[PDB]
Amino acid sequence: LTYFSARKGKRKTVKAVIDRFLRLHCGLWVRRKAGYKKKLWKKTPARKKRLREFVFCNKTQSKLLDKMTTSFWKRRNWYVDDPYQKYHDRTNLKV
Amino acid sequence: RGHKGERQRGTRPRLGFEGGQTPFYIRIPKYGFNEGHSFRRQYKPLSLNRLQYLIDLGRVDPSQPIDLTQLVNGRGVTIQPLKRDYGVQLVEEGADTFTAKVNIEVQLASELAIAAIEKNGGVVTTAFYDPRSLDIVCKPVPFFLRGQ
Amino acid sequence: TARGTPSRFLASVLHNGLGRYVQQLQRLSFSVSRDGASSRGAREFVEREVIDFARRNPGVVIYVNSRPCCVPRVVAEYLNGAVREESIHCKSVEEISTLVQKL
Amino acid sequence: VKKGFRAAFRFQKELERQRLLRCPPP
Amino acid sequence: LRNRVTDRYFRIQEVLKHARHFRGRKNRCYRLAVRTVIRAFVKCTKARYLKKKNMRTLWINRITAASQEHGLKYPALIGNLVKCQVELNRKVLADLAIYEPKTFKSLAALASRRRHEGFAAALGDGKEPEGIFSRVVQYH
Amino acid sequence: NFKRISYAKTKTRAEVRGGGRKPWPQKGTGRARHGSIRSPLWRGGGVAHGPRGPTSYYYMLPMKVRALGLKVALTVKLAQDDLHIMDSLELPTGDPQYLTELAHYRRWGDSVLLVDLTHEEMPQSIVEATSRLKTFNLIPAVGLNVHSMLKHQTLVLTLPTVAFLEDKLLWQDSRYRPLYPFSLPYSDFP
Amino acid sequence: IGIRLTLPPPKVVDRWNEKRAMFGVYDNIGILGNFEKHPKELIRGPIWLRGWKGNELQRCIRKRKMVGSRMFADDLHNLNKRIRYLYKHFNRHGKFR
Amino acid sequence: KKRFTPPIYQPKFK
Amino acid sequence: ISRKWEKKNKIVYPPQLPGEPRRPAEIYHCRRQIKYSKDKMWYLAKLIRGMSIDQALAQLEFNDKKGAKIIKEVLLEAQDMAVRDHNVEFRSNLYIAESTSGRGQCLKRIRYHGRGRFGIMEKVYCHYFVKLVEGPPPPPEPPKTAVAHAKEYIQQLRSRTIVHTL
RNA sequence: UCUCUUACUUUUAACCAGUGAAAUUGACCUGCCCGUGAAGAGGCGGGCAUAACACAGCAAGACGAGAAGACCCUAUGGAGCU
RNA sequence: ACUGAACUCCUCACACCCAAUUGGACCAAUCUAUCACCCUAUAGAAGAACUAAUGUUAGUAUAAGUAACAUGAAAACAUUCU
RNA sequence: CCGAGCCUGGUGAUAGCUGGUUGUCCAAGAUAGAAUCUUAGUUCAACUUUAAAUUUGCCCACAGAACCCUCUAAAUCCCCUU
RNA sequence: GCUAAACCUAGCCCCAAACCCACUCCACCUUACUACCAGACAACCUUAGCCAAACCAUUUACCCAAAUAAAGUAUAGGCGAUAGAAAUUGAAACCUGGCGCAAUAGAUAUAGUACCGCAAGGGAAAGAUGAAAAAUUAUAACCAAGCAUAAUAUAGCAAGGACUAACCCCUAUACCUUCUGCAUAAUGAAUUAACUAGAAAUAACUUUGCAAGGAGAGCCAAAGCUAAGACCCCCGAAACCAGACGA
Ligand SMILES: [Mg+2]
Ligand SMILES: [Mg+2]
Ligand SMILES: [Mg+2]
Ligand SMILES: [Mg+2]
Ligand SMILES: [Mg+2]
Ligand SMILES: [Mg+2]
Ligand SMILES: [Mg+2]
Ligand SMILES: [Mg+2]
Ligand SMILES: [Mg+2]
Ligand SMILES: [Mg+2]
Ligand SMILES: [Mg+2]
Ligand SMILES: [Mg+2]
Ligand SMILES: [Mg+2]
Ligand SMILES: [Mg+2]
Ligand SMILES: [Mg+2]
Ligand SMILES: [Mg+2]
Ligand SMILES: [Mg+2]
Ligand SMILES: [Mg+2]
Ligand SMILES: [Mg+2]
Ligand SMILES: [Mg+2]
Ligand SMILES: [Mg+2]
Ligand SMILES: [Mg+2]
Ligand SMILES: [Mg+2]
Ligand SMILES: [Mg+2]
Ligand SMILES: [Mg+2]
Ligand SMILES: [Mg+2]
Ligand SMILES: [Mg+2]
Ligand SMILES: [Mg+2]
Ligand SMILES: [Mg+2]
Ligand SMILES: [Mg+2]
Ligand SMILES: [Mg+2]
Ligand SMILES: [Mg+2]
Ligand SMILES: [Mg+2]
Ligand SMILES: [Mg+2]
Ligand SMILES: [Mg+2]
Ligand SMILES: [Mg+2]
Ligand SMILES: [Mg+2]
Ligand SMILES: [Mg+2]
Ligand SMILES: [Mg+2]
Ligand SMILES: [Mg+2]
Ligand SMILES: [Mg+2]
């Protein structure tokens, strides 16, 4: 994934990962369900509700997306009116 | 290196390839999560617990006004003019047990934080700074060495 | 391998157990370095245990040569004339004491 | 030349071993 | 060539000094001496069990020869010696058969009498004496 | 290690002269397959994994670790009865034989590091004494380091030098974060 | 036969030289010289790797950037070849992907 | 095809 | 290159005591770089090996080989050196004790075989060694008779022991 | 040409002298029969045979030697042609 | 009734018999810093270890003294003869 | 040595394909499959390896796990003790 | 004991500093190394391609303005492999060195010579005594493969158990690789000496240091921050393109 760039010698990111996903600072990546805007006339309302949710992903996919992004995208953001602000830190975990 | 193949001979497909199958980072549709992130303003948080702590520990002093530069010279907050921090926001996290009687000038301030400062007999004023003025007022000494 | 090495028959040297038993070792030639990290164990041995070993069995003669050398050695010559030389390069006090007792 | 000292010294001691073994002294 | 090897000759000698007594080019060329020294050390490791087995079969052969000279068979001799609680193994029995023939004839006579008392016991089911060279000593 | 720059360089198979064409084509003759002379198998070829270019070994510790190293080295030099403190370096005569016989009398050792401060107020006698000796060294107080203190057996400080050392090493304790480097004014800091 | 017959001439080294006695003096200057110079400014070497560690590819990239406008033609061609090959090696071949 | 390889001489100095 | 056979004439023994044997003379000689193979030379050096010097000269004057004349010249100059310098008084009183041949330095040529191919012809060279000892030639060791074989077999039957016990 | 081959001369060939290659070569102290085994054994099992060494022939075997099969298949390997 | 294992017991000590892969403890040669001074020690570094790639170079073997290679005769070494 | 010459350079072209991959010792260590211009490859699952946190893991008894035409077996799942 | 072994020093490599050279007389663009005669003709032009996308058809960093940072950010891209800024910040003048090699190493080099090819072009190997060779002396011997000193003795992967003795007695299907499986009659190896193959990130583990702050500006942070250690091979194609050389 261009482990070493040809101008600065740094590591590059895949821009499709940035265009598809959102990384919470705890370590979780939020994605959209596949096909949530395709062929809606044949899907039942339960399936249409199930398609519209912001959904989490697996552990190995999260490690893949951490390897595909640099350290800039794993930082702490302090946006002014962030809707996902309450889900950045995590609470009441136990191993 | 294992037995012969792409493992032993080194040449393996790039990270994320799934053997010709459409990969996991491609089957998911796009959405504007990180759409305009390079132009959204960010504000570093500052609790009243932290402000009372700084006033207690001989750091930034209530006898003088409290702009950004007094907080930075106290190192109570570290502001980065790059990566789009438009100053420090005030926030209500240490409202109870806050007795300071100070005036302050911050860049954002919630209602309860303004209230909790004003009940001890102080002043809250909300100000704006541009990123060039952020870079000046955070570290004034390299700007004075700049000669502009 | 046994075919590639010589062999002897089991025998006593001069019929020890019939009459009186005699200590079959004559000399112990210690060469210890004055300075040198290779002979620290032999240094501590010569400080603390060689006098008690010499009083333990008076039949053996012990020489401590105290010579500048990179590899300290102990030379043991027996009664019938054989000479067995083993090295005490970088060993502890316990291993050196066990070696000289086995010699 | 192969630079170094320990191998040449070890071979010199082995040469003295074989040379004393070929012609033993009185 | 930074730090290339200097004492390569001593590893060659460390392999070759166990191969001086070979035959052919195996005693000179290193590339063949390695394989033949490895196979020699492997056979030297494996031959311990074959040594113990061959020594025991030699002991059994010598005991069988001496007992056949005394008019007895070998299983009768071993069984009727172990039935009189005399726990001699094959080594000292072979050494007595070679170097001490009088006491080996005594042992063969003991085994023959224990065999005869066993035959009388099997014919009589006891009743009375259960033999005399029977009545094993009981420990507790 | 950090000042080391190794100037070793060896030629790979791309920089050795020649070696372009393929000798003895692939399928016809009965020798081994080869695509180029000056391959790393061949005599005269290039290396496969040789050293590459002038290499740097520069890395920086946190400065608290180096200041703690100086404090630890001074403590080790004091605890082992090798540290000696002078009030003012001054020699009466100025020949090195006097200094060597003095160090032989006081049971210092073969090697001793004579440390003064500011490099300009070092008197003429000690300079003319140590400028010919190989084991007696003068350094200014800014030139202190752990390696010269470990190599030399005993260590000679001066009372302004030990006050300078106390102040410069105690400044590391009870200090802020940098927030920009200390060469800038920093109102308390001179 | 590889081994040398006669032992080599014994190498004498003067540990109390000019250099080895004064090794490391004026290192650690910025801590106790009130920060006028950095210890990376004592390093005397190439102009492009002066206080910079880098990889193997990163050193050649920095060498083409800071110096390659005044190199020789053969060395510039060799440097372009080496950087092309090291890109193709580090980013495509290898383990751990 | 007519598969054939030419012979290769060695250098004359050897 | 190593020349050690020529230095063997410069050994000097200490002077003998009267109650001692004679210690007969030893004369070493060699001729280097002979244009001849080493095996065909070895056959003549094996022909000579034990015989007396006059019988050796007789067998070499009528042997039809290129090495025969060379060894006859070497033996003649060795006999002359033995009579003059090395204090041997009777000319016929010499026998060959050691005689052998070693490979000398060679050169290399091409063969130009019958295509664009070739071989490596080697221009072979060899040495010759000889050692003369004064005195009569020692008699050949006779073939061992039946009583010697019976004595060896009876001795081997005497020397066996009781194996693998005590 | 053959039924059906024979004699003679030269070259070749055998012995003596000289110069003096090449393919090949894991090590070999290198036998037969039956059976076994990666399915066709000089190296394994059971029997048989067996003092050592050249010189000159033969080609039954060493799945004999020179060519990383040219017949068949595979490769997200090439190239010619329409 | 007996023979019959690395199974078990017996005296001693016990980490010391799996492909790919993984974890751990040591270690020769070299340079450097400090020691040492008949060849060693503590640390750093690496062009840091070959029974094998029809691997490269150089030496020498086997094939092998084998294939192959030549000079017309006499003589006075003036000439003659085929 | 022409189905498209030769020499140089991109070139250390590329190859899922063949061959190779050098010191000692010890320990753990055998695979239900799915997708793929993919079955000579790769990714994810399962196993194997290391270091931590926690407490239950295996073996299992009473009870329990639709049917319908005609049999319907060796068993299996869950599972307190031990 | 023959062939033989061993040498240190010619030199070379990477940096710093500094801008570097070219007619003694004669000949040299015609068939260059030729003293001497009439058509004068003349240069200014996007590189392409291998390769990656596991194919390939747009696409794939090489471009010649010192660092670090911004930042692998905004952006571009069968929006995919990948490509990739800018505003702004600042960049302490002088010291002749090597944890670089030592004749299969280091430039190919004693040399672009011999040699090969018409031509472009390719392109090697090597020497070792010594204070005195105006000292030829006697020493300096000791070590690889190959031979000689010194051929063979019934039977068997060349060995082990041993034994009084080597053979004779019992056991034992060479090595690596690829394989479910090789002694296999599958691949590779005549031997000796030298050379010849694991280069690195994000994220984790351990050890220091500091602590709500860490760090020698930039960056990170709801116990974190800095530093160090540890970890990712060699040889091999048919092919493509560009420029020269040849009837
Ligand atoms: Mg392989
Ligand atoms: Mg496979
Ligand atoms: Mg690929
Ligand atoms: Mg048993
Ligand atoms: Mg090239
Ligand atoms: Mg090629
Ligand atoms: Mg060369
Ligand atoms: Mg080279
Ligand atoms: Mg058969
Ligand atoms: Mg065979
Ligand atoms: Mg064949
Ligand atoms: Mg093939
Ligand atoms: Mg396919
Ligand atoms: Mg294709
Ligand atoms: Mg193609
Ligand atoms: Mg074409
Ligand atoms: Mg057991
Ligand atoms: Mg290398
Ligand atoms: Mg290596
Ligand atoms: Mg080798
Ligand atoms: Mg071949
Ligand atoms: Mg090889
Ligand atoms: Mg002949
Ligand atoms: Mg023949
Ligand atoms: Mg012929
Ligand atoms: Mg390749
Ligand atoms: Mg495939
Ligand atoms: Mg294969
Ligand atoms: Mg195990
Ligand atoms: Mg598809
Ligand atoms: Mg492609
Ligand atoms: Mg050279
Ligand atoms: Mg030899
Ligand atoms: Mg046998
Ligand atoms: Mg088998
Ligand atoms: Mg191997
Ligand atoms: Mg198969
Ligand atoms: Mg085979
Ligand atoms: Mg095959
Ligand atoms: Mg072969
Ligand atoms: Mg014509």
State both tokens at F126.
Answer: 């000690």
Pairing mode, strands A29-32 and A22-23: antiparallel
- Reading the block at residue E26, the tokens are 């195996």
Way it was determined: cryo-EM
Instruction: Indicate yes or no: CB of F70 within 8 angstroms of CB of G31.
Output: yes
To the nearest 10°, report the CA torsion of G83, G85, G88, G89: -110
Give residues 129 to 148 of B whose Cβ lies within 8 Å of F.
139, 141-142, 145
Closest CA relative to residue F63, chosen from G28, I33, I3, B143:
G28
Give long-range contacts, CB 8 A cutoff, 24+ apart: G4-7: G4/D1, G4/D2, G4/D7, G4/D8, G4/D11, G5/D11, G5/D15, G6/D8, G6/D12, G7/D5, G7/D8, G7/D9, G7/D12
Phi, psi angles (nearest 5°) of residue F74: -70, -35
**Integer angstrom CA distances of residue F152 from B111, E28, F73, F137:** 67, 55, 12, 9
Contact indicator for I133, I77 with CB cutoff of 8 Å: no
| Residue F115, Ramachandran bin (φ over 0: left; ψ between -120 and 50: alpha; else beta) | beta
Torsion sign across C-alpha atoms E84, E89, E95, E98: positive
- List Cβ neighbours of I111 (8 Å cut-off, separation of 6 or more): I118, I119, I120, I121
Strand positions, DSSP E, A22-64? 22-23, 29-32, 54-56
How far is the CA of E112 from the CAs of E82, E90, E106, E119, E122, in angstroms? 12, 18, 10, 11, 15
Residue with token string 């952020």: B134
How far is the C-alpha of C103 from the C-alpha of D16, rounded, in Å? 27
Distance CA A9, CA A14 (A): 16
* Phi-psi sector, F53: left (phi>0), alpha (psi -120 to 50), beta: left
Amino acid identity of residue B5, one-letter, is G
Helix, strand counts (H, E) of chain G: 3, 0
| CB-based contact I69:I9 (threshold 8 Å) | no
Alpha helices by DSSP H, B9-125: 48-56, 68-74, 111-118
C-alpha G29/C-alpha F142 separation (Å) is 6
CA distance C30 to C40: 13
Contacts of F87 (CB under 8 A, 6+ apart): F158, F159
Q: Give the pair of three-digit tokens for residue I42.
A: 């070895």
Q: How far apart are CA B79 and CA B138, in angstroms?
A: 7
Q: Nearest-CA neighbor of A4 among E7, G60, F21? A: G60
Place of tokens 């101008």: A7
DSSP string, E34-50: HHHHHHHHHHHHHHHHH
Name the residue with tokens 């998911």.
B28
Which of the residues I161, I163, I164 would you substitute to probe the E interface, choosing the one with the greatest number of E C-beta atoms within 10 Å? I164
Contact at 8 Å (CB) between B89 and B108? yes
Give the minimum alpha-carbon distance from G8 to chain D in angstroms, rounded to a whole number: 7
- Is the shortest CB-to-strand distance from A16 to strand M under 7 Å? yes
Tokens representing C95?
A: 């291993």
Q: Where are the domains of chain G?
A: 1-96
Burial level of E110, CB count in 10 A (0-12/13-18/19+)?
A: middle
**Residue whose structure tokens are 């056949």:** E68
User: How many residues are present in chain D?
Assistant: 26
Q: For residue B23, which of A65, I62, E82, I48 has the smallest C-alpha distance?
A: A65
C-alpha C29/C-alpha C24 separation (Å) is 15
Beta-carbon contacts of residue A53 (< 8 Å; ≥ 6 apart): A33
Q: What's the token pair of residue D7?
A: 């191998």
Measured CA to CA, the distance from residue C100 to residue C56 in angstroms comes to 12
Residues of chain F contacting residue H3, judged by C-beta atoms under 8 Å apart: 27-28
Angstrom distance (rounded) from CA B35 to CA A84: 14
Q: What is the 3-state secondary structure (H, E, C) of I64-125?
A: CCHHHHHHHHHHHHHHHHHHHCCCCCCCCCEEEEEEECCECCCEEEECCCCCCCCCEEEECC
User: For the purposes of burial, counting CB atoms within 10 Å of the CB of A16, is it exposed (0-12), middle (13-18) or buried (19 or more)?
Assistant: middle
CB-CB under 8 Å, E58 with I162 = no
Provide the CA B85 to C1' M70 distance, Å, integer.
14
Taking contacts as CB-CB distances below 8 angstroms, the residues of chain G near D7 are 3-4
Side chain identity at F48, as an amino acid letter? A
List C-alpha distances in Å: I140 to I21, I133, I143: 23, 16, 9
Query: How many helices (DSSP H) and strands (DSSP E) are in chain A?
Result: 3, 3
| Chain centroid to CA E44 | 18
For B71-104, the DSSP string reads: HHHHTSS---TTTTEEEEEEE-TT-TT-----EE
Q: Chain D partners of E10 at a C-beta cutoff of 8 Å?
A: 7, 10-11
Distance CA F152, CA F161 (A): 18
Q: What is the dihedral of CA I2, I8, I11, I17, to 10 degrees?
A: 150
* Cβ contact A14–B25 (<8 Å): yes
Residue B44: count other Cβ atoms within 10 Å of its Cβ.
20
Alpha-carbon distances, residue B128 vs B89, B132, B134 (angstroms): 11, 12, 9
Residues 6+ apart with CB under 8 A from B138: B68, B69, B72, B79, B81
Q: Count CB neighbours of D20 within 10 A.
A: 10
Element containing residue F56 per DSSP (H, E): strand F55-56
In DSSP terms, which residues pair with C85 in a beta bridge?
C75
CA distance E8 to E5: 6
User: How far from each other are the two terminal CA atoms of chain I, in whole angstroms?
Assistant: 59
SS3 F83: strand
Backbone angles phi, psi at G64, to 5 degrees: -70, -25
Residue nearest to nucleotide M237 (CA to C1'): F26
- The Cα B33–Cα B54 span in angstroms is 37
Domains of chain C: 1-103 (3.40.30.10)
Q: How far apart are CA F161 and CA F166, in angstroms?
A: 9
Q: How far is G2 from chain F (nearest CA, A)?
A: 18
Nucleic strand J near CB of residue I115 (< 7 Å): no
Write out which nucleotides of chain L lie closer than 7 A to a protein Cβ: 1, 3, 7-21, 35-38, 40-45, 53-54
Whole-angstrom CA distances from G71 to B76, F98, F147, H2 are 50, 56, 38, 51
**Residue-wise burial string across I97-113, b where 16 or more C-beta atoms lie within 10 A, e elsewhere:** bebbbeebeeeeeeeee
Q: What is the dihedral of CA E79, E84, E86, E90, to 10 degrees?
A: -10
CA–CA separation, E18 vs E38, rounded Å? 10
Q: What is the resolution of this structure in A?
A: 3.5
Please name the nucleotide lying closest to E78, CA to C1': K2
Rounded to whole angstroms, how far apart are CA atoms I34 and I128?
Answer: 8
Please state whether strand J lies within 7 Å of residue F11 at its CB atom. Answer: no
Work out whether the CA dihedral B48, B54, B55, B57 comes out positive or negative.
positive
Question: Does the F1-190 domain belong in CATH 3.40.1370.10?
Answer: yes
Coil/strand/helix, residue A79? strand
Q: What is the DSSP letter of B18?
A: B
- Residue I67 CA to residue G25 CA, distance in Å, equals 79
Q: How far apart are CA C29 and CA C76, in angstroms?
A: 7
Q: Which residues in chain G have Cβ-Cβ distances shorter than 8 Å to D14?
A: none
Token digits of residue B49: 């617990």
Contacts of G47 (CB under 8 A, 6+ apart): G66, G67
Q: Rg of chain D over CA atoms, in angstroms?
A: 12
- The alpha carbon of residue H4 is apart from the nearest alpha carbon of chain F, in Å, by 7
**Which one of B15, B26, B28 has the shortest CB-CB distance to A67?**
B15
**Is residue F32 exposed (0-12), middle (13-18) or buried (19+ Cβ within 10 Å)?**
exposed
d(CA F115, CA F161): 8
* Alpha carbon distance G60, G75 (integer Å): 11
Residue of F nearest to G74 (CA): F15
d(CA F181, CA G36): 10
Testing the interface with H: which of I107, I110, I111 to mutate, by most H Cβ within 10 A?
Answer: I110
Name the minimum distance, in Å, from the CA of E93 to any CA of chain D.
48
**Amino acid letter, F28:** G
Structural domains present in chain I: 1-166 (3.90.470.10)
List phi, psi (to 5°) of G19: -80, -50
Nearest Cα residue in chain D from E5: D2
Taking the C-alpha atoms of residue B25 and residue A31, their distance in angstroms, rounded to an integer, is: 10
Q: Which residues of E touch D8 (CB under 8 A)?
A: 6
CA-closest candidate to residue A75, choices B82, C58, I11? B82
List CB-based neighbours of ion ligand 6 within 5 Å.
F 35
Residues 6+ apart with CB under 8 A from F90: F123, F125, F126
Chains G and E touch (3+ CB pairs under 8 A): yes
3-state secondary structure of I158: helix
Q: Which amino acid is at A43?
A: K
